[PDB]
Write a protein that binds this ligand. Structure first.
Ligand SMILES: CC(=O)c1cccc(N[C@H]2[C@H](N)[C@@](NC(=O)N(C)C)([C@H](C)O)[C@@](C)(O)[C@@]2(O)COC(=O)c2c(C)cccc2O)c1
Ligand SMILES: [K+]
Ligand SMILES: [Mg+2]
Ligand SMILES: [Mg+2]
Ligand SMILES: [Mg+2]
Ligand SMILES: [Mg+2]
Ligand SMILES: [Mg+2]
Ligand SMILES: [Mg+2]
Ligand SMILES: [Mg+2]
Ligand SMILES: [Mg+2]
Ligand SMILES: [Mg+2]
Ligand SMILES: [Mg+2]
Ligand SMILES: [Mg+2]
Ligand SMILES: [Mg+2]
Ligand SMILES: [Mg+2]
Ligand SMILES: [Mg+2]
Ligand SMILES: [Mg+2]
Ligand SMILES: [Mg+2]
Ligand SMILES: [Mg+2]
Ligand SMILES: [Mg+2]
Ligand SMILES: [Mg+2]
Ligand SMILES: [Mg+2]
Ligand SMILES: [Mg+2]
Ligand SMILES: [Mg+2]
Ligand SMILES: [Mg+2]
Ligand SMILES: [Mg+2]
Ligand SMILES: [Mg+2]
Ligand SMILES: [Mg+2]
Ligand SMILES: [Mg+2]
Ligand SMILES: [Mg+2]
Ligand SMILES: [Mg+2]
Ligand SMILES: [Mg+2]
Ligand SMILES: [Mg+2]
Ligand SMILES: [Mg+2]
Ligand SMILES: [Mg+2]
Ligand SMILES: [Mg+2]
Ligand SMILES: [Mg+2]
Ligand SMILES: [Mg+2]
Ligand SMILES: [Mg+2]
Ligand SMILES: [Mg+2]
Ligand SMILES: [Mg+2]
Ligand SMILES: [Mg+2]
Ligand SMILES: [Mg+2]
Ligand SMILES: [Mg+2]
Ligand SMILES: [Mg+2]
Ligand SMILES: [Mg+2]
Ligand SMILES: [Mg+2]
Ligand SMILES: [Mg+2]
Ligand SMILES: [Mg+2]
Ligand SMILES: [Mg+2]
Ligand SMILES: [Mg+2]
Ligand SMILES: [Mg+2]
Ligand SMILES: [Mg+2]
Ligand SMILES: [Mg+2]
Ligand SMILES: [Mg+2]
Ligand SMILES: [Mg+2]
Ligand SMILES: [Mg+2]
Ligand SMILES: [Mg+2]
Ligand SMILES: [Mg+2]
Ligand SMILES: [Mg+2]
Ligand SMILES: [Mg+2]
Ligand SMILES: [Mg+2]
Ligand SMILES: [Mg+2]
Ligand SMILES: [Mg+2]
Ligand SMILES: [Mg+2]
Ligand SMILES: [Mg+2]
Ligand SMILES: [Mg+2]
Ligand SMILES: [Mg+2]
Ligand SMILES: [Mg+2]
Ligand SMILES: [Mg+2]
Ligand SMILES: [Mg+2]
Ligand SMILES: [Mg+2]
Ligand SMILES: [Mg+2]
Ligand SMILES: [Mg+2]
Ligand SMILES: [Mg+2]
Ligand SMILES: [Mg+2]
Ligand SMILES: [Mg+2]
Ligand SMILES: [Mg+2]
Ligand SMILES: [Mg+2]
Ligand SMILES: [Mg+2]
Ligand SMILES: [Mg+2]
Ligand SMILES: [Mg+2]
Ligand SMILES: [Mg+2]
Ligand SMILES: [Mg+2]
Ligand SMILES: [Mg+2]
Ligand SMILES: [Mg+2]
Ligand SMILES: [Mg+2]
Ligand SMILES: [Mg+2]
Ligand SMILES: [Mg+2]
Ligand SMILES: [Mg+2]
Ligand SMILES: [Mg+2]
Ligand SMILES: [Mg+2]
Ligand SMILES: [Mg+2]
Ligand SMILES: [Mg+2]
Ligand SMILES: [Mg+2]
Ligand SMILES: [Mg+2]
Ligand SMILES: [Mg+2]
Ligand SMILES: [Mg+2]
Ligand SMILES: [Mg+2]
Ligand SMILES: [Mg+2]
Ligand SMILES: [Mg+2]
Ligand SMILES: [Mg+2]
Ligand SMILES: [Mg+2]
Ligand SMILES: [Mg+2]
Ligand SMILES: [Mg+2]
Ligand SMILES: [Mg+2]
Ligand SMILES: [Mg+2]
Ligand SMILES: [Mg+2]
Ligand SMILES: [Mg+2]
Ligand SMILES: [Mg+2]
Ligand SMILES: [Mg+2]
Ligand SMILES: [Mg+2]
Ligand SMILES: [Mg+2]
Ligand SMILES: [Mg+2]
Ligand SMILES: [Mg+2]
Ligand SMILES: [Mg+2]
Ligand SMILES: [Mg+2]
Ligand SMILES: [Mg+2]
Ligand SMILES: [Mg+2]
Ligand SMILES: [Mg+2]
Ligand SMILES: [Mg+2]
Ligand SMILES: [Mg+2]
Ligand SMILES: [Mg+2]
Ligand SMILES: [Mg+2]
Ligand SMILES: [Mg+2]
Ligand SMILES: [Mg+2]
Ligand SMILES: [Mg+2]
Ligand SMILES: [Mg+2]
Ligand SMILES: [Mg+2]
Ligand SMILES: [Mg+2]
Ligand SMILES: [Mg+2]
Ligand SMILES: [Mg+2]
Ligand SMILES: [Mg+2]
Ligand SMILES: [Mg+2]
Ligand SMILES: [Mg+2]
Ligand SMILES: [Mg+2]
Ligand SMILES: [Mg+2]
Ligand SMILES: [Mg+2]
Ligand SMILES: [Mg+2]
Ligand SMILES: [Mg+2]
Ligand SMILES: [Mg+2]
Ligand SMILES: [Mg+2]
Ligand SMILES: [Mg+2]
Ligand SMILES: [Mg+2]
Ligand SMILES: [Mg+2]
Ligand SMILES: [Mg+2]
Ligand SMILES: [Mg+2]
Ligand SMILES: [Mg+2]
Ligand SMILES: [Mg+2]
Ligand SMILES: [Mg+2]
Ligand SMILES: [Mg+2]
Ligand SMILES: [Mg+2]
Ligand SMILES: [Mg+2]
Ligand SMILES: [Mg+2]
Ligand SMILES: [Mg+2]
Ligand SMILES: [Mg+2]
Ligand SMILES: [Mg+2]
Ligand SMILES: [Mg+2]
Ligand SMILES: [Mg+2]
Ligand SMILES: [Mg+2]
Ligand SMILES: [Mg+2]
Ligand SMILES: [Mg+2]
Ligand SMILES: [Mg+2]
Ligand SMILES: [Mg+2]
Ligand SMILES: [Mg+2]
Ligand SMILES: [Mg+2]
Ligand SMILES: [Mg+2]
Ligand SMILES: [Mg+2]
Ligand SMILES: [Mg+2]
Ligand SMILES: [Mg+2]
Ligand SMILES: [Mg+2]
Ligand SMILES: [Mg+2]
Ligand SMILES: [Mg+2]
Ligand SMILES: [Mg+2]
Ligand SMILES: [Mg+2]
Ligand SMILES: [Mg+2]
Ligand SMILES: [Mg+2]
Ligand SMILES: [Mg+2]
Ligand SMILES: [Mg+2]
Ligand SMILES: [Mg+2]
Ligand SMILES: [Mg+2]
Ligand SMILES: [Mg+2]
Ligand SMILES: [Mg+2]
Ligand SMILES: [Mg+2]
Ligand SMILES: [Mg+2]
Ligand SMILES: [Mg+2]
Ligand SMILES: [Mg+2]
Ligand SMILES: [Mg+2]
Ligand SMILES: [Mg+2]
Ligand SMILES: [Mg+2]
Ligand SMILES: [Mg+2]
Ligand SMILES: [Mg+2]
Ligand SMILES: [Mg+2]
Ligand SMILES: [Mg+2]
Ligand SMILES: [Mg+2]
Ligand SMILES: [Mg+2]
Ligand SMILES: [Mg+2]
Ligand SMILES: [Mg+2]
Ligand SMILES: [Mg+2]
Ligand SMILES: [Mg+2]
Ligand SMILES: [Mg+2]
Ligand SMILES: [Mg+2]
Ligand SMILES: [Mg+2]
Ligand SMILES: [Mg+2]
Ligand SMILES: [Mg+2]
Ligand SMILES: [Mg+2]
Ligand SMILES: [Mg+2]
Ligand SMILES: [Mg+2]
Lengths: 48, 275
RNA sequence: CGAUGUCGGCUCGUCGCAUCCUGGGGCUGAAGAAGGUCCCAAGGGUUGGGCUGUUCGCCCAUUAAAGCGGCACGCGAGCUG
RNA sequence: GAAUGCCGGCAUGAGUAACGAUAAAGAGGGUGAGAAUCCCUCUCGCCGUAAGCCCAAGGGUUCCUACGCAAUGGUCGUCAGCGUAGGGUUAGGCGGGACCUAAGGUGAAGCCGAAAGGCGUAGCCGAAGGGCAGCCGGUUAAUAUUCCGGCCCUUCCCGCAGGUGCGAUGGGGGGACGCUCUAGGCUAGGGGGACCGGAGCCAUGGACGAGCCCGGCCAGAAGCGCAGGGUGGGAGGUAGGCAAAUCCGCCUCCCAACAAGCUCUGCGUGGUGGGGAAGCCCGUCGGGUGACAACCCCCCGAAGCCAGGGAGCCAAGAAAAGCCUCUAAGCACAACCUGCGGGAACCCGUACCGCAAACCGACACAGGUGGGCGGGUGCAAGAGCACUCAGGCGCGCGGGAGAACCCUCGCCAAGGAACUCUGCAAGUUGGCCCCGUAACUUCGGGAGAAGGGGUGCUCCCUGGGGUGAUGAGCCCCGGGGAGCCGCAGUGAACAGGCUCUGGCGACUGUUUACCAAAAACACAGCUCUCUGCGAACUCGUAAGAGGAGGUAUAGGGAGCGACGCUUGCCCGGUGCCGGAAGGUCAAGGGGAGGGGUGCAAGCCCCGAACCGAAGCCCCGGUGAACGGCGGCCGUAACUAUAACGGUCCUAAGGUAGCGAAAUUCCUUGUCGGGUAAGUUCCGACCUGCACGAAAAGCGUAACGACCGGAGCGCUGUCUCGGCGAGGGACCCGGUGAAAUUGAACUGGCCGUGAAGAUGCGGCCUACCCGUGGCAGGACGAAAAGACCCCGUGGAGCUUUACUGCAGCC
RNA sequence: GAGCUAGCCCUGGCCAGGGUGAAGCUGGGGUGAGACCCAGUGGAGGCCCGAACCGGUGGGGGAUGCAAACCCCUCGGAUGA
RNA sequence: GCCCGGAUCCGGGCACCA
RNA sequence: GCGGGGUGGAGCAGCCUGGUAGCUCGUCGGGCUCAUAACCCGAAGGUCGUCGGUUCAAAUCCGGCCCCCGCAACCA
RNA sequence: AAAUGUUC
RNA sequence: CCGAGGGUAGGGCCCGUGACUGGGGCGAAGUCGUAACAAGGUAGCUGUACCGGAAGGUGCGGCUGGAU
RNA sequence: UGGGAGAGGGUGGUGGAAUUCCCGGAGUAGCGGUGAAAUGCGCAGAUACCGGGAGGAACGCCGAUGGCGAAGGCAGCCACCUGGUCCACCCGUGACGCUGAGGCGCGAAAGCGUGGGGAGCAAACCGGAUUAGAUACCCGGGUAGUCCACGCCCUAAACG
């Protein structure tokens, strides 16, 4: 049946994307957090 | 009148529709329409703030002239009478001799091709607009301003009217459609006559679908819900109210007056409404 | 109670005997026939249907008779629900 | 050594279940160490509104070729979407961008908020909408509207000529719009041809035939033809379109208007450029040949094109730019328009999968995934159904055997619901044409009621329509005779069982994603109530929104729930509404009178009467507001019963109508119906445990995958089972799990034991080890019982529990 | 976190075929004129039958599944809320 | 408990209760 | 199981707070009327369900017992 | 004020 | 071919009968009231509507077959 | 042809008296009601009085033993549209007449539907009395309805 993951590149970049994060105090805290942990990807990868 | 149907479907048995006799032009004036922004009952937070709304037929907004005092002494001809999906009343298209074209709400008895005008000097005739103080005491009147130059606020619904009862200083006394007796400032404009399409209230929607066309989503009773939802929620099987009958937000809904007592306009209302 | 699934049906039985029938008896207010009542006897047998979820019970039509009870009110790693 | 401990490793169950749709395979020939599984060929089967073909998401090299087989592949593997390597994606015209706006988002100005931030007109962003210039073929192992070939077209820049008051983010027009139905004419696509072109073929009894088999087109500028869309021309006035305007709008006059003209599309033709089958050759995907291929006629014909077409209807159907026009600063050696010429034309995507083994489902997963094409025949039609074209497949374990048992299927003597909670299930019925069809009804319906007849093939006669020509042909509806065959003619496939009668809900709808589809929710309709507009109400601290660019024929809230006939009595309590009196009433006012201190002026504290809001009390109203609507005793010239009376209580004592009911405890009440028999059912009765009038009462045609009862039909439900089929189970080869598991050398009885013993006692029985089976036990497995209790454990919910808070006064 | 699901907003798309035959309109009848009756035309509808599509009624299977909701047979809606 | 009320005591009015 | 009740013939006060049983109707005797009802004037009738106990004294307070209404009888 | 009057 | 009739299916009229139910008629001396006939003690009757144990009452309009 | 009287009918408009409610003034101890009373209303300022307002309904005197109409029925006043009808004249047509089963229309009140309207009145209903009772007569309230529009119903002591 129709499952929960329904990949969509625009949706992905617009929701979790770098610019979406930077636009918000929470999003910046995420970026700050993932940088501090030293994540290789701060933001989900998506091919635009 | 109001057109009926043979019961060739269950719903068609009771459905009635407007007769549309008075309508002379079947599409609007292109330069007088802007898109109506459907809201779904949602405000700018995105929250439903008026329940049970959405999904009705798409509409175009027809720009209505609720000032009229904008064009004193410039007469106009009634070019056509048109359907307006944003109001109960029909609208009349005015070709001003000016060359300007404007919409007004169509008063009862307006005939296409006749001539109307606004101003103190205007004839007391169906379709004309004067400040209230220059209108004979006792004449029926619609599209009434409530304060000077602020726009026609009273009596705009199909069939409705106000009647001038008397005068007192800068103010005249109107009986609103509701039966309330209010003082309205004399310099406020008003169009003589009552609004057309009086048969509008005799309309039987006929079936659930028709309400939906009007953008009216199904209304669900409190009694049908759970205590989380509504004061009338829950109970095993059907239940009576079991408290004073209440709104979803708790306040009482049978009789509890809600107009603010200390409202500055209180000085101007002589007698609270009729029945 | 770190689980012993709970009524009734179905299927499959098996046991007890305080015996419903069949077999053997004594007493009879047992003429015969047919009954009553107690004794011995568990080998076999113990029907089909209407109503109800019903067990039970009532009812129809029969029957030699249409027994009663145990088996976790036998039987859901056998079914039903 | 235990923590259903944690991490790891390795056992057991076990060579067990399974190996993922029952569409299906067989052989021959290759390759190779090795082949059911890879390649080739032939035969067979499956899909064919797909299981074929294009596109968009998403995926991201999976594409092509070489070389590989450790792992991946449910087996095998020489093969592969796998490993290694090399190659492969080519655009002014296709898609997006250098264009436009939609919701929404953002946001000069501005507004708000402790901070973070929230809003916000313009503006900007935002597309699968608007706008915009490329079609056919050839080519590669792999790309092609991209490269090539042919024929076309767009914008930008410069220049030449001709022409004009040129000029914009400003004015205006246009763009620009729904649903249903639908005309004409075309095209896509299809069928037929005795006409044209073609390698051939004559078999097995017959046919050298008007035989069979194959094919008979595609693209195309200007011009032309056909079909359609759009569109009036002129003058004068002008105060409106936030400046101006010759434009647009408005007024007047003139001419002409199912025309024309002008203009734009579609289709046809068209210089020219392509394509071009079967067959048998060579291959093993393609090539060569056919072939100077032919490239014609007739019919069917779109839902697509002309398209911004037409009609009707109500629910009344984006915006903005491109584009045209008008003028403003300006500038008129400029600028624009038109024609021609030369030059200029950027960025990103382009492989491949794409109803799936490459996307979403942990899997090469019977699931899910939006758009277009989707051939032929026959069955009334059709995207249905059977078969089949192109094309694509046989589903990545096989071979046997022919048990029980399970699944899916077929048939069944006599009976025919006797089955069972229940005809659950499965029969029956089944399309079309004709005949025919009841109660009742809201006159639509109930209707496909019910019930019946017909149905194929052949010959003869014949009616009307389309196309053409008014004829031939082709095509589409029919009609009338006479016949033939079979058990049977919708001969296959697809395709209602019917009726009678109750309950509930009017009806179509909606719902507990994944145990409830219903009588629940919704619903039109009815009523109450709030709301005069900066509405009430709602969301927010606010600003600001929604309400509504609405205005009482409107908006909020509540109950009831089409319709019909109705909806009684109670206002003492609670609610809401009204009431300028009176009672209480906080802060504050007032300050009689007292006090601390000081030598004192003074400073400081307490403080009575009186004044003092809402709320509460108090006076009224109010039921489609919350709610409520009695008891005991007696009485009729038979009994029985009580129209009648007595009395206590109440705020008032249940009216109409219903009633053993979705409500009746006693209860299977009683009586009647139906049955041989009726705890159900239907009709009645009424001592209604415990109906009753908008938490509506009583009815109601129609409707219902709702729940009752009954009858006919027909049946494997059953008496009562039997046989048959296939897929499993079974055997052999390949791969090979799982929960569970203190260890086990793990029998019956009668006892005993923490009270139900393989494990203790006594007796009895018993050679060792398996395989197929069955499920009584191992208080079998699973889940730290979801019932119950306990915990001064938790959470949801309620209110006249407590205490706060928002909100309101 | 609304790429599942619920509602709404903007913008597109889809719904084989067949049936029933409302209003209207035309003609006829009717009448003082009317209502109204009749035939034809017409093509309405939360209308009927039935694919796609959306559903999920009953049963059976599945139950360490093909699948953490699936398959088969049935069955509901299918111009509309 | 106190003050405002009526013909020691019932009226009441507000307030307190460890 | 829990609450309420039992008093002239009927229906209800009195009980809580002990001493004194009352109200409407009925019944009886008189009136009025031809007579009847209604109406008017007078009167009788309760040892307070029963047996215990408390008290100087019990309808009254307390215990049993007999009745009569009401409410409950839930979780599997 | 004032209800009523057994049957032939 | 027609055809007595038999069979199946669905209608129509009529008759008998039916738990119960609705009023009607009759019945020497039942119960409750007293509506009507005298102004019948509220003039009556009336069509209708609502209501009430019952006669009846009341509203609206009519009639005199009423007032004396 | 010419004249007439009339509440004949339909529509639109308009006039004053009265009742009720509301607002203001002034005023105070009751008003109202009956057989008598009570309910009810009134110091929260009623009744009675004056001014202003709103609304609905019916039109006093004229008014009659009157007039009109087929019947039901029709009454302030104005106008409009319209029916009947009588009289004069003796002009026109030449029996064109009478009645009328069916049919069609009209048809007081009450009642019903959908909207409005709602002052007074008033079934139902509540209360106060009367009474043995009083589901009545009397009193205080009071909802349909009475009024308008449209559509039904089609009855009557629709009677002379
Ligand atoms: C004059 C006289 O004695 C008297 C007394 C009191 C009242 C009256 N007047 C009248 C009595 N109150 C009565 N009428 C009445 O009250 N009115 C306000 C008219 C009443 C409704 O029944 C009456 C019709 O009965 C009455 O007219 C006479 O009836 C009786 O009275 C009455 C009845 C019916 C039964 C017994 C006695 C009676 O008086 C009269
Ligand atoms: K429980
Ligand atoms: Mg997942
Ligand atoms: Mg999706
Ligand atoms: Mg995307
Ligand atoms: Mg996208
Ligand atoms: Mg997206
Ligand atoms: Mg982003
Ligand atoms: Mg920052
Ligand atoms: Mg990581
Ligand atoms: Mg790194
Ligand atoms: Mg991130
Ligand atoms: Mg209708
Ligand atoms: Mg209209
Ligand atoms: Mg526009
Ligand atoms: Mg926004
Ligand atoms: Mg936001
Ligand atoms: Mg709301
Ligand atoms: Mg909403
Ligand atoms: Mg309108
Ligand atoms: Mg709408
Ligand atoms: Mg609702
Ligand atoms: Mg609920
Ligand atoms: Mg919630
Ligand atoms: Mg709540
Ligand atoms: Mg509740
Ligand atoms: Mg409930
Ligand atoms: Mg509920
Ligand atoms: Mg309940
Ligand atoms: Mg309740
Ligand atoms: Mg209720
Ligand atoms: Mg309550
Ligand atoms: Mg409440
Ligand atoms: Mg008001
Ligand atoms: Mg236990
Ligand atoms: Mg365990
Ligand atoms: Mg367990
Ligand atoms: Mg014997
Ligand atoms: Mg003998
Ligand atoms: Mg025996
Ligand atoms: Mg039984
Ligand atoms: Mg029993
Ligand atoms: Mg015998
Ligand atoms: Mg057991
Ligand atoms: Mg037991
Ligand atoms: Mg058992
Ligand atoms: Mg047993
Ligand atoms: Mg068992
Ligand atoms: Mg089981
Ligand atoms: Mg069982
Ligand atoms: Mg078990
Ligand atoms: Mg078994
Ligand atoms: Mg230890
Ligand atoms: Mg373990
Ligand atoms: Mg642990
Ligand atoms: Mg092993
Ligand atoms: Mg095993
Ligand atoms: Mg498996
Ligand atoms: Mg499998
Ligand atoms: Mg497989
Ligand atoms: Mg192989
Ligand atoms: Mg091999
Ligand atoms: Mg294979
Ligand atoms: Mg091969
Ligand atoms: Mg096909
Ligand atoms: Mg198909
Ligand atoms: Mg390998
Ligand atoms: Mg190998
Ligand atoms: Mg290998
Ligand atoms: Mg592998
Ligand atoms: Mg392998
Ligand atoms: Mg696999
Ligand atoms: Mg090799
Ligand atoms: Mg190119
Ligand atoms: Mg550039
Ligand atoms: Mg752009
Ligand atoms: Mg833009
Ligand atoms: Mg954006
Ligand atoms: Mg675009
Ligand atoms: Mg393009
Ligand atoms: Mg090229
Ligand atoms: Mg020019
Ligand atoms: Mg438009
Ligand atoms: Mg559009
Ligand atoms: Mg073409
Ligand atoms: Mg064809
Ligand atoms: Mg101008
Ligand atoms: Mg201008
Ligand atoms: Mg070729
Ligand atoms: Mg050649
Ligand atoms: Mg088009
Ligand atoms: Mg429509
Ligand atoms: Mg200049
Ligand atoms: Mg110059
Ligand atoms: Mg660039
Ligand atoms: Mg660049
Ligand atoms: Mg690029
Ligand atoms: Mg490409
Ligand atoms: Mg697709
Ligand atoms: Mg694939
Ligand atoms: Mg999964
Ligand atoms: Mg596979
Ligand atoms: Mg798959
Ligand atoms: Mg067919
Ligand atoms: Mg296969
Ligand atoms: Mg075998
Ligand atoms: Mg058989
Ligand atoms: Mg049968
Ligand atoms: Mg039979
Ligand atoms: Mg049966
Ligand atoms: Mg069939
Ligand atoms: Mg009919
Ligand atoms: Mg049939
Ligand atoms: Mg044949
Ligand atoms: Mg069918
Ligand atoms: Mg329903
Ligand atoms: Mg329902
Ligand atoms: Mg569910
Ligand atoms: Mg659930
Ligand atoms: Mg769930
Ligand atoms: Mg669930
Ligand atoms: Mg289910
Ligand atoms: Mg359903
Ligand atoms: Mg509902
Ligand atoms: Mg209704
Ligand atoms: Mg809020
Ligand atoms: Mg708005
Ligand atoms: Mg309801
Ligand atoms: Mg009350
Ligand atoms: Mg009250
Ligand atoms: Mg109250
Ligand atoms: Mg104070
Ligand atoms: Mg106060
Ligand atoms: Mg009620
Ligand atoms: Mg109460
Ligand atoms: Mg009751
Ligand atoms: Mg009553
Ligand atoms: Mg009643
Ligand atoms: Mg009963
Ligand atoms: Mg019964
Ligand atoms: Mg019972
Ligand atoms: Mg029972
Ligand atoms: Mg009974
Ligand atoms: Mg109720
Ligand atoms: Mg009912
Ligand atoms: Mg009916
Ligand atoms: Mg019904
Ligand atoms: Mg019905
Ligand atoms: Mg249904
Ligand atoms: Mg259903
Ligand atoms: Mg049944
Ligand atoms: Mg069988
Ligand atoms: Mg087999
Ligand atoms: Mg072997
Ligand atoms: Mg394991
Ligand atoms: Mg051991
Ligand atoms: Mg061992
Ligand atoms: Mg051993
Ligand atoms: Mg023991
Ligand atoms: Mg033992
Ligand atoms: Mg042993
Ligand atoms: Mg031992
Ligand atoms: Mg031993
Ligand atoms: Mg033994
Ligand atoms: Mg076992
Ligand atoms: Mg066991
Ligand atoms: Mg077991
Ligand atoms: Mg479990
Ligand atoms: Mg635990
Ligand atoms: Mg536990
Ligand atoms: Mg548990
Ligand atoms: Mg317990
Ligand atoms: Mg505690
Ligand atoms: Mg404790
Ligand atoms: Mg707690
Ligand atoms: Mg809690
Ligand atoms: Mg509030
Ligand atoms: Mg999404
Ligand atoms: Mg149709
Ligand atoms: Mg139909
Ligand atoms: Mg299903
Ligand atoms: Mg499952
Ligand atoms: Mg399935
Ligand atoms: Mg279906
Ligand atoms: Mg259908
Ligand atoms: Mg007492
Ligand atoms: Mg005498
Ligand atoms: Mg007497
Ligand atoms: Mg004493
Ligand atoms: Mg004593
Ligand atoms: Mg409980
Ligand atoms: Mg008497
Ligand atoms: Mg015969
Ligand atoms: Mg009398
Ligand atoms: Mg009388
Ligand atoms: Mg009288
Ligand atoms: Mg009575
Ligand atoms: Mg009365
Ligand atoms: Mg009268
Ligand atoms: Mg005073
Ligand atoms: Mg008024
Ligand atoms: Mg006549
Ligand atoms: Mg009337
Ligand atoms: Mg009374
Ligand atoms: Mg009396
Ligand atoms: Mg009485
Ligand atoms: Mg009414
Ligand atoms: Mg009448």
């Amino acid at each position: 049946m129709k499952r929960t993951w329904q990949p969509n590149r625009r949706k992905r970049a617009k929701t979790h994307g770098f610019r979406a994060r930077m636009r918000t105090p929470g999003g910046r805290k995420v970026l700050k957090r993932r940088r501090q942990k030293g994540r290789w990807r701060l933001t989900p990868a998506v091919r635009k | 009148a109001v057109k009926k149907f043979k019961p060739y479907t269950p719903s068609r048995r009771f459905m009635t529709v407007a007769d549309f006799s008075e309508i002379t032009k079947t599409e609007p004036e292109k330069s007088l329409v802007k898109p109506l922004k459907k809201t779904g009952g949602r405000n700018n937070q995105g929250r439903i703030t008026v329940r049970f709304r959405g999904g009705g037929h798409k509409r175009l907004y027809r720009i209505i002239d609720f000032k009229r005092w904008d064009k004193v002494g410039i007469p106009a001809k009634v070019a056509a009478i048109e359907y307006d999906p944003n109001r109960s009343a029909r609208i009349a298209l005015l070709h001003y001799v000016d060359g300007e074209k404007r919409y007004i709400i169509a008063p009862d008895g307006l005939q296409v091709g006749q001539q109307v005008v606004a101003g103190p000097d205007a004839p007391i005739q169906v379709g004309n607009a004067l400040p209230l103080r220059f209108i004979p005491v006792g004449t029926v009147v619609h599209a009434v301003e409530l304060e000077p130059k602020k726009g026609a606020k009273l009596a705009r619904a199909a069939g409705t009217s106000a009647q001038i009862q008397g005068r007192e200083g800068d103010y005249v006394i109107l009986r609103l459609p509701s039966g309330e007796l209010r003082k309205v400032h004399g310099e406020c404009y008003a169009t003589v006559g009552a609004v057309g399409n009086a048969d509008h209230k005799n309309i039987v929607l006929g079936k659930a679908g028709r309400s939906r066309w009007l953008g009216r989503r199904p209304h669900v009773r409190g009694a049908a819900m759970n205590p989380v939802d509504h004061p009338h929620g829950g109970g095993e099987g059907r239940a009576p109210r079991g408290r004073p009958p209440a709104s979803p937000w708790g306040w009482q809904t049978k009789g509890l007056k809600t107009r603010k007592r200390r409202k500055p306009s209180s000085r101007f209302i002589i007698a609270r409404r009729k029945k």
